[PDB]
C-alpha cells in the first residue's frame, strides 16, 4: 500500500494480467502461511510459483545427475530379462545377459548389444521383444576385428 | 505443518504430476553429461559404481567460504554465461 | 472448496441490480404496449428475488466453521501436527526398511534367473 | 569508494522500492521484447538479473505481490542463452495473459 | 515509472567491485560493499483492518451488533437471525423507493442511501468472517496430506510380505547362490543330478 501504490502510478502493469484480487487473496494466504514452517519449500509453492504456464512453452535447463542414471540401469536390469522371460521367440543361438545392455554374443562371428528407447511398461503379449536399439557392434571375426 | 512441504506434490496432483519416465527423459538426458551414448555408458556403469565410493566420500572437510556469498556468487556465473556465446554450436549438416 | 461467503455477493450485489432493471417493467412498458404478461414478470420480482435471499440463509447454515472458534481450530491443527508430523518419520522410514533390501533380494532372484539360462542352453 | 560518487543519477532510493518496482515490469509481454535493445539484456544487464535471486527466499518473497514477475524470473532462469530468454518472445507472451489470468 | 525505468546500477555491478569484497571482508580480520548488500525493506503496510474500521465510520447499524458478536448459543444467533432480519428489512427498504416513486421523486431516490448504509451491515461482516475461510481450507488440505501419506501404506505394506514370501517361495533360499558358490553348484544342483 505504501511504495506499491507508487508502483501503480507508473504504466499500471505488473500485473500485466487483468487479474489482481487473486494476488490479494494470495497475500491473505501468506498471512496464513506465517503460522506455518515447516517448510520454506512450501512457501512460493503454496502460491504455485512458475505454475501459471509451466505446461505451456518454456524450455528449462535442470541437469540430470547423477546416481539417478544408475537406477535406470537397474530398471533395464530387471526389465529386459522379463521381456525375455516372456517373449522371447527366439532367436537362438543367443546368450542373453541383462547387464546395462542386453548382450548377444556369438562364437567365431560377433558380439552385439541392445537397449530400448521408447517405453518399459508394455511387455507380455504385444511385448514380444518389441522396442530395441543397437548399442554397438564389436564383431569378433577371427580374420578381421579391429573395428574402426 | 511439515506436510505442507509435500503439498506441492498435491499441487502437482492437480496437474501433470511430473513427466517421469520417457525415452528422451533418460536417454536424451544421458546424451547430456556422461556419456558418449549408451556405448560409453555401458563401461561407465562400473565407473559410476566407483564414483559412488571415494567421490562421494568427501561429505565435509573444508572452510565455510561464506565470503563468496551470496548474490555476488550469483553474479559470478555471468562470466561463464557471456563466455557461453562463443560456442557457435554445432553441426552444419 | 473454500470462501463460500463470496458467493453470497453474487446472491446480493448482483441481485441488487435486478431491482433496478425491474424499474422499466413497472412504468415504461405500460406506455407503448399482452400487457398482462408484464404482471407475471412482476410476480417473480415479488417472489424469486426473495427466495434466493432465503437460500442465502441456508447458505449461512452451510458456512464452514459453524462452531466459530478459530482459536480452537488452530489447536485442532496442533493435534493434526501431533498426528501427521509423527506419522511422517514412520512413513518415510518404511521405504528405507523396504526397497533397500528388496533391491538386493530381487538381485537374489536375478541370480537364479541367470542360472536358469544355463539349463536353457546346455 | 569513488564509484558511489560516480553514481550521480544512480544510487537513488535503492532498497525495497525501486528494485521491486523494476522487477514488476517484466510481466508486460512486449517489455521483454523491449529488453532486446540496449537498456539491458545479456551484457552488464545480466548482473542485475543474477543479483536479484535472493528475492526468491522467504520473507523477501512475502513482500512480492504479483507472481507473474517471478515467473518472468523463471523465464530468465530458463535457457536465457536461447529463445527462452534472449530471442524471447514476440507478442506470443500476451497469449499467456489470456490463459493464466483466467486461472 | 522510474527515471528512466531501466536500472542505473549496472555501473556499480562491475565484477571487479565484487572482487573488492574478497579484499574488504578480510581487510578487517581483526566501503562500497554496502552497495552489493541486501536492500532495506519497509513494512510496508501491515495495517488492513483499520480500513474496515473506517468503513464502519464510512456511514453501521446492526454491524455494531456484529461487533458485539466478536467476543448453538454464543454469537451465532446474532450472525444468523439478526442478519436474516437485515435481509427482510432490506426487502422492506425497496418500498422507500419503488413503493412510492411517481409521487414527487425527490427524497425517495435518496432513501436508497439508507440501503447503501445498510451495505456496511452486510458484506463487511462477511469480510470479517472471510479469514476464517482460510483456516477452514487449510484444515481441509492438512489431512489430504495425511492421505498422500496413506498411499505409502496403501502400497508398501503390500510389497513387503509379498516380496518376503516370494523370496521364500520358488526362490526359497535366494541367498543359496552365495554369489561364487552358485557357480559350480549350478552344475552340482543339476549336472550332478542323474
XYZ file of C-alpha atoms in Angstrom, chain E residues 10-178:
169
model
C 24.925 -1.575 -13.805
C 27.950 0.687 -13.453
C 28.105 -0.421 -9.823
C 27.727 -4.020 -10.955
C 31.259 -4.319 -12.323
C 32.738 -7.683 -11.410
C 35.944 -6.221 -10.013
C 33.901 -4.339 -7.419
C 32.641 -7.740 -6.333
C 36.284 -8.757 -6.340
C 36.812 -5.937 -3.855
C 34.670 -7.859 -1.380
C 37.262 -10.614 -1.140
C 39.727 -7.944 -0.059
C 37.488 -5.875 2.232
C 35.962 -8.765 4.172
C 39.444 -9.965 5.106
C 40.595 -6.359 5.471
C 39.156 -6.428 8.981
C 40.400 -9.865 10.016
C 40.979 -8.425 13.488
C 33.459 0.847 1.741
C 31.440 0.140 -1.408
C 30.442 -3.327 -0.182
C 27.167 -1.929 1.150
C 26.141 -1.325 -2.450
C 26.127 -5.081 -3.035
C 24.446 -5.791 0.297
C 20.810 -6.851 0.551
C 18.307 -3.929 0.440
C 16.439 -2.424 3.386
C 12.684 -3.014 3.360
C 9.568 -1.238 4.628
C 6.681 -2.937 6.428
C 5.421 -1.552 4.044
C 1.824 -1.503 5.247
C 0.832 -4.372 7.543
C -2.278 -2.435 8.580
C -5.517 -3.587 6.954
C -8.366 -3.928 9.470
C -8.185 -0.183 10.065
C -9.674 0.403 6.621
C -12.625 -1.723 7.720
C -12.873 0.371 10.876
C -13.001 3.414 8.599
C -15.721 1.618 6.654
C -17.638 1.446 9.924
C -17.206 5.220 10.004
C -17.981 5.457 6.279
C -21.687 5.783 7.094
C -23.032 0.667 10.821
C -26.466 -0.170 12.221
C -26.614 -3.864 13.099
C -22.964 -4.104 12.091
C -22.212 -2.809 15.577
C -24.179 -5.806 16.833
C -21.912 -7.878 14.613
C -19.046 -6.271 16.510
C -20.857 -7.400 19.651
C -20.733 -10.886 18.151
C -16.950 -10.507 18.166
C -16.469 -11.589 21.781
C -25.689 -23.025 19.120
C -25.850 -20.088 21.541
C -22.971 -17.607 21.684
C -22.640 -15.164 18.789
C -24.257 -17.480 16.236
C -27.865 -16.226 16.546
C -26.573 -12.666 16.153
C -24.925 -13.616 12.872
C -27.949 -15.652 11.826
C -31.407 -14.450 12.808
C -30.476 -10.780 13.050
C -28.838 -10.946 9.627
C -31.968 -12.538 8.210
C -33.819 -9.625 9.773
C -31.424 -7.322 7.947
C -32.334 -9.144 4.747
C -36.077 -8.848 5.280
C -35.623 -5.206 6.238
C -33.572 -4.834 3.070
C -36.624 -6.076 1.208
C -38.718 -3.584 3.181
C -36.495 -0.710 2.056
C -37.466 -1.048 -1.611
C -40.864 0.463 -0.819
C -38.996 3.604 0.228
C -38.025 3.798 -3.437
C -40.299 1.998 -5.891
C -43.146 1.683 -3.380
C -43.679 5.420 -3.705
C -41.825 6.846 -6.698
C -44.163 8.581 -9.152
C -45.292 10.959 -6.403
C -42.508 13.571 -6.329
C -39.314 11.511 -6.819
C -37.001 13.685 -4.712
C -36.317 12.245 -1.260
C -37.425 8.782 -2.410
C -34.412 8.008 -4.629
C -32.292 9.278 -1.720
C -33.995 6.726 0.541
C -31.708 4.191 -1.163
C -28.819 5.898 0.627
C -30.097 4.185 3.763
C -29.688 0.886 1.923
C -26.133 1.753 0.946
C -25.580 2.495 4.629
C -27.019 -0.974 5.254
C -24.338 -2.436 2.978
C -21.956 -1.667 5.837
C -24.098 -4.039 7.893
C -23.803 -6.754 5.249
C -20.742 -7.625 3.155
C -18.348 -6.106 5.667
C -19.181 -8.734 8.291
C -18.684 -11.297 5.540
C -15.205 -9.859 5.111
C -14.882 -10.065 8.891
C -15.528 -13.792 8.641
C -13.507 -14.190 5.422
C -10.107 -15.022 7.016
C -11.785 -17.893 8.886
C -12.373 -19.478 5.474
C -8.601 -19.702 5.083
C -8.495 -21.710 8.292
C -11.240 -23.979 7.023
C -9.426 -24.553 3.728
C -6.062 -25.132 5.372
C -7.652 -27.670 7.671
C -9.333 -29.052 4.557
C -5.936 -29.729 2.979
C -3.922 -30.724 6.030
C -5.377 -34.235 6.268
C -5.289 -34.537 2.481
C -1.558 -34.511 3.022
C -2.208 -37.259 5.545
C -3.895 -39.137 2.698
C -0.868 -38.744 0.470
C 0.902 -40.262 3.457
C -1.710 -43.013 3.488
C -0.845 -44.050 -0.056
C 2.549 -45.251 1.129
C 0.716 -47.618 3.461
C -1.549 -48.406 0.519
C 1.393 -49.825 -1.393
C 4.465 -50.615 0.725
C 2.534 -52.763 3.170
C 1.555 -54.871 0.185
C 5.040 -55.010 -1.305
C 6.598 -56.132 1.966
C 5.324 -59.545 2.945
C 4.719 -60.404 -0.678
C 8.351 -59.754 -1.533
C 9.413 -61.727 1.511
C 7.270 -64.761 0.764
C 8.109 -64.719 -2.937
C 11.711 -64.762 -1.794
C 10.728 -67.713 0.384
C 8.765 -69.468 -2.361
C 10.275 -70.603 -5.641
C 13.342 -68.559 -4.767
C 13.168 -70.230 -1.345
C 16.764 -69.562 -0.425
C 17.551 -66.570 -2.611
C 20.878 -66.492 -0.803
C 21.558 -70.086 -1.852
C 23.703 -68.882 -4.745
C 26.082 -67.205 -2.293
